[PDB]
A paper describes a structure:
[name] proteins [name] and [name] are mutated in rare cases of heritable FTD, ALS and PD and aggregate in tissues affected by these diseases. For [name] and D2, the central conserved VAV motif forms a beta-strand that is associated with the protofilament interface in all the structures we have observed, suggesting that it may be a critical element in fibril formation and may be expected to appear in ex vivo structures as well.
Interestingly, however, this mutation appeared to enhance [name]-NT aggregation, as assessed via ThT fluorescence, although not nearly to the extent of the S59L mutation. We show here that the p.[name] [name] mutation, situated far outside the [name]-NT fibril core region, adopts the polymorph-2 structure of WT [name]-NT, providing further evidence, albeit from a single sample and structure, that this fold is favored when the WT [name]-NT sequence is preserved in the fibril core region. Although such patients are quite rare, we were able to obtain skin fibroblasts from patients with the p.[name] disease-associated [name] mutation.
Residue numbers in the entry:
A (entry chain P), B (entry chain R), C (entry chain N), D (entry chain Q), E (entry chain M), F (entry chain O), ...: 43 to 76
The structure:
Amino acid sequence: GLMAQMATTAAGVAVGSAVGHVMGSALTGAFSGG
Amino acid sequence: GLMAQMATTAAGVAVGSAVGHVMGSALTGAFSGG
Amino acid sequence: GLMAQMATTAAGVAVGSAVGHVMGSALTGAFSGG
Amino acid sequence: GLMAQMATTAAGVAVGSAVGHVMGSALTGAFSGG
Amino acid sequence: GLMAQMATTAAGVAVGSAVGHVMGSALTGAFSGG
Amino acid sequence: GLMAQMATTAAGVAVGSAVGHVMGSALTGAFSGG
Amino acid sequence: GLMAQMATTAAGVAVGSAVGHVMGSALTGAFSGG
Amino acid sequence: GLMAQMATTAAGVAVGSAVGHVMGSALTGAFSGG
Amino acid sequence: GLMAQMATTAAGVAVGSAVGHVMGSALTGAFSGG
Amino acid sequence: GLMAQMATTAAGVAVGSAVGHVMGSALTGAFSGG
Amino acid sequence: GLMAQMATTAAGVAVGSAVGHVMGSALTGAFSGG
Amino acid sequence: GLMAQMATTAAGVAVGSAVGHVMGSALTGAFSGG
Amino acid sequence: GLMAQMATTAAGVAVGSAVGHVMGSALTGAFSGG
Amino acid sequence: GLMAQMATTAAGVAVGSAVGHVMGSALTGAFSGG
Amino acid sequence: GLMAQMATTAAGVAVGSAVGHVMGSALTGAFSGG
Amino acid sequence: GLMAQMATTAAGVAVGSAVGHVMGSALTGAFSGG
Amino acid sequence: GLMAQMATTAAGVAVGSAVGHVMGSALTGAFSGG
Amino acid sequence: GLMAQMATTAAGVAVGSAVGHVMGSALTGAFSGG
């Protein structure tokens, strides 16, 4: 099979932009205030 | 089969924009205030 | 079969915009105030 | 006087998030399909 | 005087979230299909 | 006077995040499909 | 007066993140598809 | 099968932009305030 | 007066991150597809 | 099979830009405030 | 007056990171596809 | 199979840009504030 | 007056990192595909 | 199989640019504030 | 007045890093594909 | 199999640029503030 | 007045690193593909 | 098999540039502030 992700961005003026892609992966994260 | 995600963004002026894609993945997260 | 997600955004002026896609994934999250 | 904007975000798992702030500015944008 | 805007967001799992703030500004936008 | 913008972000797992700040500025943008 | 912008980001795992600050500036942009 | 990720970005003026790709990987992260 | 911009970033694992600051400047950009 | 990641960036003026690619790898990170 | 920009970055593992500062400058750029 | 990563960057003016590629590797990192 | 820019970077493992500073300068650039 | 990484960069004016490639390697790093 | 730029970098392992400083200068560049 | 890394850089004016390649190697590093 | 630029770099292992400083100078460059 | 690394650099004016290649080697480094 075909598994694809696409993301096209166009702008006259851009201040903040971000693109993130995740495919077939294991992500684990922990956060502690103190 | 075909599994696809698409996201097109166009703007004259953009201040805050973000695109996120997740496919076939395991994500685990924990948050603690203190 | 075909499983697709699409999202097109166009604007003259954009201040806050975000796009999120989730497909065939396991997401677990925990939040603690203190 | 005091003019302030605040935005706090916390999440166990976040896929798409964006924050935009505009203060005392002139923004002009134009969009054309073709 | 005091002019403030606040926005707090907390979630165990978040897919799409966006925050936008506008204060004392001039925004002009135009859109054309073709 | 005091003019301040703040934005705090915390997450166990983050895929797409973006922060944009505009203060006392002139932004002009134009977009053309073809 | 005091004009300040702040942005703090913390995450266990981050894939896409971006921070943009604009203060007292003139930005002009033009986009053409063809 | 074919597994592909694409991300095209075009802008007249860009201040903050970031692109992140993850495929078939194991990511583990830990955060401690103090 | 005091004009300051701050941006602090901390993460266990970071794939894509970018920080941009603009203060008291003139930016002009043009884009042409062909 | 074919596993490919692509990222094209074009801009008249760019201040902050970053591209990150991860494929078939093990990443482990730890952060301590003090 | 005092005009300062600060940017601190800390991470256990970093793949793509970039920091850009612009102050009191004139930037002009042009892009042509062909 | 074929495993490839590509990243093309073009800009009239670039201040901060960085490209990072990781393939089939083991990365371990530790951070301590004090 | 005082005009200063600071950028501190610390990481256990870093693959791609870049820092750019511009102050009181004139930058002009042109790009042509062919 | 074929495992390749490519990165092409072109700019009229470039202040900060860096390219990093990692393939089939073991990287270990430790950081201590004091 | 005082005009200073600082950039400190520390890492356990660094593959690609670059630092660029521009102050009170005129930079002109031209690029041609063919 | 074929394992190749390529990196081409072209610019009218370049202030800071660096290219790093790692293939099939063991890298270990330690950092101590004091 | 005082105009100073500083750049300190420390790393356990460094593969690619470069530092560039420009102050009060005129730089002109031209590039031609053929 | 074939294991090759290539890096081509061309610029009208270059101030800081460095190229580093590592293949099939063991690198160990230690750093101490005092």
